[PDB]
Ligand binder design. Sequence first.
Ligand SMILES: CC(C)C[C@@H](C=O)NC(=O)[C@H](CC(C)C)NC(=O)[C@H](CC(C)C)NC(=O)OCc1ccccc1
Ligand SMILES: CC(C)C[C@@H](C=O)NC(=O)[C@H](CC(C)C)NC(=O)[C@H](CC(C)C)NC(=O)OCc1ccccc1
Ligand SMILES: CC(C)C[C@@H](C=O)NC(=O)[C@H](CC(C)C)NC(=O)[C@H](CC(C)C)NC(=O)OCc1ccccc1
Ligand SMILES: CC(C)C[C@@H](C=O)NC(=O)[C@H](CC(C)C)NC(=O)[C@H](CC(C)C)NC(=O)OCc1ccccc1
Lengths: 212, 200, 220, 212, 204, 202, 202, 196, 196
Amino acid sequence: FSPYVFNGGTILAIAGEDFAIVASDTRLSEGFSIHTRDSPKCYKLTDKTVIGCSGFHGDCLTLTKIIEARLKMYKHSNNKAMTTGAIAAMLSTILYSRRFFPYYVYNIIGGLDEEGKGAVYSFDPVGSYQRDSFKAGGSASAMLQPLLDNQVGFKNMQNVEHVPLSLDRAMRLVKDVFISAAERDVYTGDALRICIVTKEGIREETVSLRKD
Amino acid sequence: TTTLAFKFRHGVIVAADSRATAGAYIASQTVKKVIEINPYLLGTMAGGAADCSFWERLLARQCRIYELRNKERISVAAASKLLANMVYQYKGMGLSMGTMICGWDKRGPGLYYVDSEGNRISGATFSVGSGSVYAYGVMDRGYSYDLEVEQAYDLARRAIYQATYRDAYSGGAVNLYHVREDGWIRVSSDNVADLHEKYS
Amino acid sequence: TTIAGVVYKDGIVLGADTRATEGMVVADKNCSKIHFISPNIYCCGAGTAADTDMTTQLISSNLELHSLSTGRLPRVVTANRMLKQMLFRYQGYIGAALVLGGVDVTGPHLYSIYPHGSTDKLPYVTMGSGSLAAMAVFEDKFRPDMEEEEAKNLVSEAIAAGIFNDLGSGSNIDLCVISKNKLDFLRPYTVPNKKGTRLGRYRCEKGTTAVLTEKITPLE
Amino acid sequence: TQNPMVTGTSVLGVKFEGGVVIAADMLGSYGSLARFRNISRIMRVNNSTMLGASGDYADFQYLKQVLGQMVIDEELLGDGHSYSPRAIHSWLTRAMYSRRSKMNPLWNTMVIGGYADGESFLGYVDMLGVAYEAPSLATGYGAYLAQPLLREVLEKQPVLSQTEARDLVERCMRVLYYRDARSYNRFQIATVTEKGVEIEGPLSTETNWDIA
Amino acid sequence: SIMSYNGGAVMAMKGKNCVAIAADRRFGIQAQMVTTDFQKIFPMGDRLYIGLAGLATDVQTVAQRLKFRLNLYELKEGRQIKPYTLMSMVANLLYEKRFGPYYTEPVIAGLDPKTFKPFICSLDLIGCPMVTDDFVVSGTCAEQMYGMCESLWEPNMDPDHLFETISQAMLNAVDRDAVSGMGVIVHIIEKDKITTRTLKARMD
Amino acid sequence: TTIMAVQFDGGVVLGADSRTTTGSYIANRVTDKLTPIHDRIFCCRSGSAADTQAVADAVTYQLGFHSIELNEPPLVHTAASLFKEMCYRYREDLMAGIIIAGWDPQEGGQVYSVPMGGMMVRQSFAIGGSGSSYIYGYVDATYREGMTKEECLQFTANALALAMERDGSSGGVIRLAAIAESGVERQVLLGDQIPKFAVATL
Amino acid sequence: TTIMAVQFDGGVVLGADSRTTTGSYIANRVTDKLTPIHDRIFCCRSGSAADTQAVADAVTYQLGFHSIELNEPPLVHTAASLFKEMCYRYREDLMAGIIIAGWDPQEGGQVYSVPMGGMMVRQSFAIGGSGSSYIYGYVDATYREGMTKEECLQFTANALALAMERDGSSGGVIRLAAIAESGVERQVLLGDQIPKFAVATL
Amino acid sequence: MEYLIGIQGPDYVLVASDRVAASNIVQMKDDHDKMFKMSEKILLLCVGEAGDTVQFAEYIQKNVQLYKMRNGYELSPTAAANFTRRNLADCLRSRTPYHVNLLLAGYDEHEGPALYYMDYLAALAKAPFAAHGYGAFLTLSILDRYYTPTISRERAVELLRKCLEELQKRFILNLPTFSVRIIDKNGIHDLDNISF
Amino acid sequence: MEYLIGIQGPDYVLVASDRVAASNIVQMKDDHDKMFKMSEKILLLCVGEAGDTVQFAEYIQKNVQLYKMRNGYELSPTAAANFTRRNLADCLRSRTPYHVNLLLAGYDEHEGPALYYMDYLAALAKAPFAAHGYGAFLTLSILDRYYTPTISRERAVELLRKCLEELQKRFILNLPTFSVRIIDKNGIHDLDNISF
Ligand SMILES: CC(C)C[C@@H](C=O)NC(=O)[C@H](CC(C)C)NC(=O)[C@H](CC(C)C)NC(=O)OCc1ccccc1
Ligand SMILES: CC(C)C[C@@H](C=O)NC(=O)[C@H](CC(C)C)NC(=O)[C@H](CC(C)C)NC(=O)OCc1ccccc1
Ligand SMILES: CC(C)C[C@@H](C=O)NC(=O)[C@H](CC(C)C)NC(=O)[C@H](CC(C)C)NC(=O)OCc1ccccc1
Ligand SMILES: CC(C)C[C@@H](C=O)NC(=O)[C@H](CC(C)C)NC(=O)[C@H](CC(C)C)NC(=O)OCc1ccccc1
């Protein structure tokens, strides 16, 4: 008996000056088969925070329910909603509690900081987390990170002006990167769920990818 | 990972790289591997990122409870013993954690190497990580207790740079801290790419 | 891989997907899985690409030497016997699952060959990781003695089932129709899936990449 | 079950307009041998929920007892509150994930079908806590043989009638008999509607053509 | 883990009447670099080249054994090899070792010896050829290289734009691979010239 | 797989299911496991498809050359012996259970079971395959000496049906063959033609 | 081992072989695998001797205390439920295939199969053991609804005899018990009393 | 393990090798020589499994010496490095593989000094400086920090000393003496052993 | 491995330990002390798996120092050896075994000098001289050839230097410095370190 199964899934998160974009594909798979062509991997935790989860869907469903309970429990004892950084810190402890039987999940939290700026925190299966400006996770993490490092980071490029990232360029980059991943990753490619966090709230958009 | 620490005439110099890897995939090149337990005590992280980060944060919370209860900051020796005793309880279970606890106590500048395999040793110069061997050669040929502060800073940066060059798992920026009686300071975070141009 | 084959009233319709994958990453988005064995015989191949593109190539050479000596069109039974008697002496070490189909002097003949040497002459056959999706379409819609357009729509529907339901299958649909009077190889028969349009321009202009050294060798 | 014993084959479910229909063969195989050929692998939970299970039949019989008692218990309260299809599906996911985490899994893949509040529920629960909802579901070899045919129809015509849904199931049950070696011709069909859950008798796919 | 022992990355891209072939330059054992100037791309004709990634012994052996056959073919047939024939030849050598293969996957970039038409290709470790009309990648950063070339490659790129694309794709992909890099070399093959450039790359 | 052969005064009746399986998948649902090695000698193949097809092809070749050289119809024992020779010689590289039954002008209708391992034994009736186990008590209880081709054809059809209903690796159609001096008559039982037995209700 | 239980209007007929074996050695050649759990509820045991005996003792202990408190003859479904509950809670520690058959004033004669794993099914006729594999076809061709107690006795005898002739772990004598409201009637068939089927000798 | 080091200079190639032969926990020899004279201007420093080093090294030496006798001239450092690589690579997939890590060093009157690093898998790389052994991990960085392409033969011996002093301080194995030789236009020259 | 040697004389016990803390091919410390003071007349030299050595040794040290505090007198070298052997044998079949090889050296006014040997299996052996490590295989024979029950403390340091110089010539590991301490009626005396 093997307690884990890779169910596929790609998650991306880009932080801006007033917006944070968490995005994911909507494909659940087991082996060379497709369970559902409509399973988004993004979850709204607060009006200012969304988490993306990929790996073993059994552990993903459990962790999100554990996180939602812990968020309500923090509000009951502290009389205030949890910050994106507080959720990032708690997740690291919730993940390391299962160090000897880890949750096979890759988590990227996107939200606004207490100053209203975007905040992306990337997490490893057993805890390790870090604030980043952009992060891809899941099946096509290695196919999406390189272009984001070049376009959003402006790396390996000379004589190029480092303009601040607009939401529109961020939106177009997210869509373009997922279309390239869909053409080369077999686990990514049903639809794209883009969730955008701003002062107004978490707007959600869905685009179509390629059905195998 | 290449972490370095040496005790000289003007205190203790602590240096590290910034690369984190998931296999042969560079997950990050901006990881902070030096933990500020107190304004005067710092820990370095080499091995499992989650393991090292979790137990140094547990040591920081334990060292604060010590200051509140005993109205005095823990010694570098007492902090290293807590970490060693904590990790010993899970010996053989697979924790990978190589660390260096550096600071200024009432006995003066202190540097301790605590591993997840039960090792706790004091010393003047330690280097932990996959680039430790590469860094030891340079720091040893340039180490001197009577080294000047700027010479000590340059030695730490060169030793980390020469290891980021020979070790595939080490790279990013050399982050340098200087622990002194007034407390540690963050001297610099130079990228190895700009140091390749300087050292050539 | 989704390779399928059906025997209709006038001949045989073979079909295949066009995706090759190394691990869980796509390597070729337009591979040819239908191979020429003889002017009257074609073979769809699934499994190790190098094995299916060498067992077929060697049998095509041997049936050519046979047809030059005999002076007669090759018989699909000769290809099956040659292919099976080779796959057997390798005990499944050469992983070549194939759908051999052709029309000879005795009519149209469709066969399934497995990497160990087993063959099966059947009216409809499917192979590859998309075989059961394709078989569900054939066990639900196959009717004996159909027409070309009806039989071609069936093999495209079977290939689509594997392309949209299998993860090792995808890209375009190729169909090879063989009659006693015509061999139609429709390589890009149906292009069911396409890459989305780029929304942002990421072109790097001259000067973006810094070079350390350059050497231009003039060619005559 | 660390090692499954007498087990059932595939269970199919498709949501039509006004309810859901599930189908299962009435056979329990003991490793190739068709030992028990008149066992129901479908269960009526409440008046709005029905459960079909694949895998160990003893593990399913245990669940029929626990879920059966849970429904009797809530009815004794007489408070006008009843477990809904999504609540039973939520409970089964937590039940399987807990057992998998104890390394003692219930070897069962279940399809929950339900109709409540003019809304059709069709959920999937595996033995690892992997759960999802879909317009059509198929367990075991039904995933590689029947789901393709079901999904093709549910794409051109997203909403099917009860007659169109029953016809699709009978065609998928026929294909499963032809290419599944653990399948039996005698099978049951269960439909949940506003009129409650009904389980059809020992139906046969005598629509088996054999042009050998 | 027999291909990540020595690391490596090679990429070939098509342009308008021009081809490009780039390679990393690091030679290392597991995590130790030994040299930063190892050759992985070898000339197989005036406008024909082959980039080899995998075990470094296999890169050198396959190149040398390919030159043996190529020089014999060129002298006997009295003509330069056309890009497609070299691919068929490499496939024959690699498959002759099907049960006990060379741990190297080759990319061929060249212009037809007469029509000067761009040809690029990739073969597996047992010799399975795949001709593409866009780009071909091979190495330990292949996934990173796929994502970069799928989002940056454009049709009918000129010689200068082909250099800026193959170079940017190689530099950002090897920067996410720990066992690949220590320099990048790029050969732009055109009808009248072969420009070779070394790029400023992270040496970490 | 269920293969069965019975001898009658004048010939032999042979029978088989029609199911090929890769795991629990039915690769072929209409397979012919009754192969003709010569004009009046057939084989019932069980076990590995590739191994059984290769050995049957080899024996047909060797038996064909022997018959043209020795200008005389082949003996059923000779075919069984050539099958035994290969199946014993490659017993460690071949999974093949075979029943060689046919009619010869000298010894009449003969049924020979060359099981796995390479052993060869003449039998009044022979059964083989994964479904053979479920019908051992039936064949032992229903077999009677002096049966006819018609009674023997019913015995084979009834026995194969019971095995095909209990063995998952057996099923499809029942292919029957009757070999006698007159010739070889082949018959396929499908659907309601396949013998049926009532299930219980409790 | 071969164990069989058959229902009839008024009661059930249980039967078993008598061979306990360790490898290919027969430790007990006259074992009784038919154990009275209560006055009109017996269990046919198959699998591990120690596990079967331990479970039958525990269920007899529990059923007896239950019947004393309730002050009523116990139900065969209650006996089958207790066996299933213990054989499912300890499925990984016990190798116990059991068939519970008996009579009760409510549902009359009832046969329940509790195979290894812990599932329980009410059946018209149940067969268990390593010899059941050979009698599946025979029991599916000769079972007829409406059989009398005498016919059910003859049916069980012929079935157990056929499996004892083809299974190495089965043999000895055939022990049969017919339970009804009148009571239990146990008998042993030895030697010639055991049904005989002519072996086909060429 | 055993230690091999090579530093290529503008007109010379300096090589050093440890002089210890160990059984298990005991050094059975402290005057061992791991350098073989292939030609008058080519040296092969070989380390590896017992029996495999001399069997492969003596084989390459007798074949390079046969070339000089058969052709009247000697093989160049590059030809010798390639001949060695082909033989080590052609016995890798054979049933008799040689576990040997080598450092060929030679001086061609035309191409000048050359140092070639080869691993047991038979990967040949030309290097300005290279080392073989676990001690290479503690010394390659000292060479990278101080090696300059125009290093003098005097400064080359000083850097060799810096690297061997590092082995005495940080290495866990007692490597006390080192055989030091240099190659140039005038041939191979034995230098004093750096002992500690 | 680490080296421990103890030589007992007519009225004293001389002990020595290597001063190196290694970590995979590297010496991370050259001034390590493997000797723990239990009383003013008993020394415990512990070597073995990391953590187990300091964890077990500090436990015995604290329990011995607790006995002096509660009883006003100190435990004998023999009672300390027996107490240690019990604490290692009880943890032997436990889930937390300690892998520690130890030499206990102590002096009692009545029983005089005493040297005890204990292995990870927890066997206690009193011996005139003893050693732990792979270097014991090369030094116990020199101790057997030159040891006399009436050896002076000056001739004893000479026998110790003969054993340590044998490690400097035949052992494969670099053990350059050795701590030396003597116990007598006047307590433990730290003699100069024997370095090479
Ligand atoms: C602890 C510091 C040195 C930080 C960091 C820098 O090297 N550590 C590391 O990179 C090493 C990688 C390797 C040496 C095992 N340890 C690590 O844990 C990192 C974790 C993320 C940073 C990717 N790499 C890794 O493989 O973790 C993935 C993982 C996931 C689940 C369980 C265990 C391990
Ligand atoms: C004509 C078809 C056989 C081509 C296609 C269809 O199956 N091949 C495939 O899909 C298979 C996937 C595998 C699951 C069989 N992929 C491949 O065969 C690819 C070839 C592409 C990179 C061009 N090569 C490959 O992975 O071979 C590695 C290998 C090496 C030695 C033995 C076995 C396998
Ligand atoms: C002898 C024939 C009449 C076949 C007959 C057996 O009795 N029926 C069967 O079902 C046997 C079952 C056997 C494994 C016991 N089937 C088989 O032997 C199958 C048949 C292949 C054509 C798929 N062979 C097999 O499993 O290995 C060959 C193979 C090679 C590649 C992929 C899948 C299968
Ligand atoms: C007694 C019935 C439950 C059925 C009985 C008859 O086969 N079962 C058995 O005999 C099984 C068969 C199998 C588990 C090896 N054998 C057994 O349970 C053991 C074998 C030991 C290694 C545990 N046989 C044995 O030791 O004999 C004990 C015995 C002897 C006589 C009467 C009752 C019990």
